[PDB]
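Morning!

As promised:
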Amino acid sequence: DGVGSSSGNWHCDSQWLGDRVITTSTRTWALPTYNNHLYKQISNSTSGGSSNDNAYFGYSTPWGYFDFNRFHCHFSPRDWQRLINNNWGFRPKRLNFKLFNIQVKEVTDNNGVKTIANNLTSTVQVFTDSDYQLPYVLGSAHEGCLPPFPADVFMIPQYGYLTLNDGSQAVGRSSFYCLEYFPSQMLRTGNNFQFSYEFENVPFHSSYAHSQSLDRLMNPLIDQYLYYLSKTINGQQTLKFSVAGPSNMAVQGRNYIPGPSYRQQRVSTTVTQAAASEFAWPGASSWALNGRNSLMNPGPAMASHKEGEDRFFPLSGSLIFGKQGTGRDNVDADKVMITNEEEIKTTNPVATESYGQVATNHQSAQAQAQTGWVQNQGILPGMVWQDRDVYLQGPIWAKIPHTDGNFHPSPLMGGFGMKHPPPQILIKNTPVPADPPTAFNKDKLNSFITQYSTGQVSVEIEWELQKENSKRWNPEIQYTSNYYKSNNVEFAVNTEGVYSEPRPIGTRYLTRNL
Amino acid sequence: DGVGSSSGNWHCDSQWLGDRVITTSTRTWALPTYNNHLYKQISNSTSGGSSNDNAYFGYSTPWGYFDFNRFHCHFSPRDWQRLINNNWGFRPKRLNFKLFNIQVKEVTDNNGVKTIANNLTSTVQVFTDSDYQLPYVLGSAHEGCLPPFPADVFMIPQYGYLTLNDGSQAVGRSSFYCLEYFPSQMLRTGNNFQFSYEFENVPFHSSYAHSQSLDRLMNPLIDQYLYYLSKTINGQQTLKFSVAGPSNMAVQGRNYIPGPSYRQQRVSTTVTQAAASEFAWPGASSWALNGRNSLMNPGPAMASHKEGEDRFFPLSGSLIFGKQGTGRDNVDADKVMITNEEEIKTTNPVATESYGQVATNHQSAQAQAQTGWVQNQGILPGMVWQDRDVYLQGPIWAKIPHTDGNFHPSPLMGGFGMKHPPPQILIKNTPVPADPPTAFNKDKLNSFITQYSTGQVSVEIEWELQKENSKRWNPEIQYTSNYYKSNNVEFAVNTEGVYSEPRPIGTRYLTRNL
Amino acid sequence: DGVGSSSGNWHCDSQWLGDRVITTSTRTWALPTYNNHLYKQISNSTSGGSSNDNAYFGYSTPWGYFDFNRFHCHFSPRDWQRLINNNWGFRPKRLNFKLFNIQVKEVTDNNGVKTIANNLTSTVQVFTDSDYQLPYVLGSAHEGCLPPFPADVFMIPQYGYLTLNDGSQAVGRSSFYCLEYFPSQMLRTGNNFQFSYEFENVPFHSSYAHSQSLDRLMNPLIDQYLYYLSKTINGQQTLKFSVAGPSNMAVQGRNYIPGPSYRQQRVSTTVTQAAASEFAWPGASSWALNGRNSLMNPGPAMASHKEGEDRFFPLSGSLIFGKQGTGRDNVDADKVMITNEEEIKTTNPVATESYGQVATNHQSAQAQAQTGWVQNQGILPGMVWQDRDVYLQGPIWAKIPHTDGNFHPSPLMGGFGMKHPPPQILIKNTPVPADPPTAFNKDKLNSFITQYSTGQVSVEIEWELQKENSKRWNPEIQYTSNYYKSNNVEFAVNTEGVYSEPRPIGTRYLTRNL
């Protein structure tokens, strides 16, 4: 429109209908100039790294991008509490995104002092990768998302991507992408940008915990009409059979079995434990691709620990969040928040235990029957399992890789897997050259006016709800704040205005039968 | 129609529309009399074999069959080059088949000299197994398909099938099929045969190579909001956590993991390597069925070798084609063409490497953390993979076995899996008895006129194309002939008129993101 | 239709309308099996040649082809005489082609004796290269055309083509063409083939000789109003000028100049001339392409000899025809017929003379004026010329090479140049395999029934005529037979039934002004 007219209003609210909840969040963003308007080839050689498992090749772009792939970007703690305490499931339906109130500033430095002024004629470029023609980086748990607290002003992360690499070198199959080779809208201070997106059909997330275990689905009062091998010896091959009943539930015939497993090493959170060695990488569970070892993290959805063993967690089978103010490198256990998936112990195997035992020979009068531990078990017919729970500060969705085949493409870090997820939204400040020389020079200009941009961003997502119809008589487990006095209110600001999330919040508090 | 009128024309051409390509191929065939018009029980006893893994029971029929289940039967090398260099995928849509210009000949031998003359009144019988009531032998990479060179005249292979066997003996469940118990059209020299077939819906074949690896999908500039266990000891269980970022990509959380594996033994193509033993069968990867060991060949789609290790190939995990003129038994490595699947190293594990490592115990102050190699890994949720590539001389389709359950029924040798593939087309010369005795004899006649038949066969297949919409800036890898001078043109005839295919041609040259 | 019904009639006649003449010719042809149904790579190595100017690479096909690119294939000598004596020009308009009365024979040899019998069920394949996708070999003066005498039975020439070569080797850019990769009609004894072709617009051939010379177009009674430099010296630079008039026609100003030239060495037909050396190749005029020297033959259209010098002919600037019964190698001059282009001496320069003289320095008081002979002269503005005359036994048309640029694409051997000439008509006997073995063998069949085919071919061409409207008073020169007695009639059969053409007949007997 014009310089003196706002191009949008501040929309931040949650609307709770019967089977739907609509979340709207608005944030103020700041966008600097990245790479000084240049594309730069990057690799482990340019970052000084030399281990082959950490080798890479790719490019850093002068473009930024908008990321809102975390639940706390849309749900307040109270809204999250309502969702998890009142619904058996939820899933995103549609998306509305807006950019408005664009403000481009120029920075001039004379001597140790910088002056900031408006550049009303400068432009900012925005486009969406609706055709998914660029590498998708929103499927990784990267920082730079919209802040959970609406009052926080955030910096737009720089967009970068990786391609095929051989050590620090590239190959002929490696691809180079120029983001200026895409049509993009150019916005001055009076312009705004908006688009709508429809989520593809995805299953409802399981925001419930099973009230029954897979091995306890039988009637505890009635025998089965099936027999099991009880005895074998007299005290001669004396085969004896008995009815499987309530007194021996472990040997009863069952129609379904627990889901797959990929065993994790076990770590205790108890201080004054002596470790026998440094094992964080040597003892790690891991998968190899083209000679590169990657850590299995978080791996298949498995129960974090057995009943009563909350002190143990899988070495890399659980999401680890950092508390507010936590450092980047080598922080203590009390500075991080270790999530656990104990709710899925009713259907999924324990992460730090073998799946089971399998016969490994033919027993005879000369050879005793032998069994072997199954540390990793693939998918078998009749298996049932629960996917990893999602969290308030955890990811929402991920892009299913474009491959010939996949099985249960639920993101392993939690969330909804989609072939066509919300498109990447890329933003960049248009370069503004400084005064050029009065004589023609064919070289590209390298002198630009120092600029940055700021504005507001709004994203609205409609969520579909799956209401609970339980006939359970006794009250359910519910997420609740603790009344006991404390120096600060949980999920609030401190005396210095710092917002903090004191604990990870799952979704599985209500119960339903298996 | 009549003796002196052709029943069809020679159609051999390729028509390239926008999203579709129509291939038409015509060949001249010759059909002899098989088994002297008899059905014969066959087994490993009748072929003199005595190893139980090679034991069989079945029947050889006097019928021949038409096979066009190889890509070079329909695509010329130039058409194949266009398809692979300009399309991200393709799949068959519909089929047209024709038999015409039937010519039945009689052969008479007087003394060391044979005379060939037309038998205008004799008939040839043709029918299609549209109901799939006969054993399907087109799903195996058998010889006898239409020649890649249109000028070559080919011999129709004899139809045979196998049933249940116990050693060299049959069981009560074994089935015997009489092909004369089917309605078939009888054609004289003036008649022709034709039918149309519609391919069932199949996914597009992946004629692309990924430009990204599964372990390099993150933004190389932004840290994750997740932590990993870095340290453990002081130099006391001192648990330390760090942010997973660009400097350590191997430990970053990931949503998807590489596909399944079934490890192959590794063989070097380098001459003057000393082998430690004869291992081609003892070292083989293998699966057992009812006490019979079958070689795992080609097995699950896995990367043939790591980067830079082209000299290595899996022992039986790759398709091996023979060069023109190559012998049948014990030929050298230079007489065969070893295909490789290096393009799928971005998503599939290396065939000659373990899938990864899994924890095998509980670490403590007394026991060091232990890990074990995963040589075989089944399907797990979140896995993605690419199927085996198809080749110009490789198979096109296969029949999915009629079973209660299957997973990703893409043929392991490459191609399109279908419950209802193109039906088997069976052809046989009608027996023409010689002069019978003037006195009645109840025994079946065993004196027949020596006959064979010849004619033309045409098959037209419409293929749907998936065009590429890449935004890649740098040029792609393309299949191209080499300009450098040579004695012969590749994919052409020699000075003796022998057509040869000098190398296997895949389909994965273009690139797309993962 | 049927075995016992003719598929066409014998049409051979000429119809003379006002401005059009329609020629129809029918011939009986015989087609053997070429290369034993095989494609064969050929080169100068396979023919034993080692000079680099004669090096080649290409392929010989089992296909034959129909050629009627000679005027005597359509015009009888009397029709040719009428055309040349009554018309100032002519050009082809449209074409009708027919194949009918197909007869396929099988040949069996027992011991030194061959038996020929009909094979009523065998087929012959015919198609036209209407899209010009195959190398065009009809643009060369090759043998194998329809005989000039309608009663002669001719053998169909074998089709072959050449591609890019480096010595006896090929390069990556070399192309291999399979003629079975084209749709073709298959004809039994009852079938026939026909198609129509429309000639693209071409200029009328000049069937006239100019009655004026380019240097004698002025009025012989009137002076010009232009002056020329007559004198220079006194006997001091004394410049003198004079009027150019009838007394000095050589110095008169002229608006147009004779056409281009490329000088030929001069050869006398007079016996008992002593040559100073062997010069037939060393003295030859020639052009080089990629290091290969090709003879300039027949080169640009130039006058064969000056007035009264009929004994001289250019070394390779004239078409040389062989008399009936003339051998292939090293025949005497009386065994060949040397054509001459003396009719174009009025506009074209003499082939064995320089185009003219050009100044080569600046004359002064110290340096005498110098001139140099112009042995080769390119196109200049104001040039006019006549193209090479066509002959009764000479070629009719040629295909203009598909190139970015060309100038006056009239074929240098004479005729009409067309981007889309009459398409090549290719014919082949369908291979008929002998008795195949009773056991399947994957190799292509190499045992075939010995066969050949015969039939009639008819071609009808409509020619447009350009009538003469001369006001010349005295009678014109006309082609006429000589009344004087001779042992045989010219253009007739001998006592042994051998038809002969005793002399080449041009088209330029009538006259018109320049």
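The radius of gyration of chain B is 28 Å.

Hope this helps with the figure draft.
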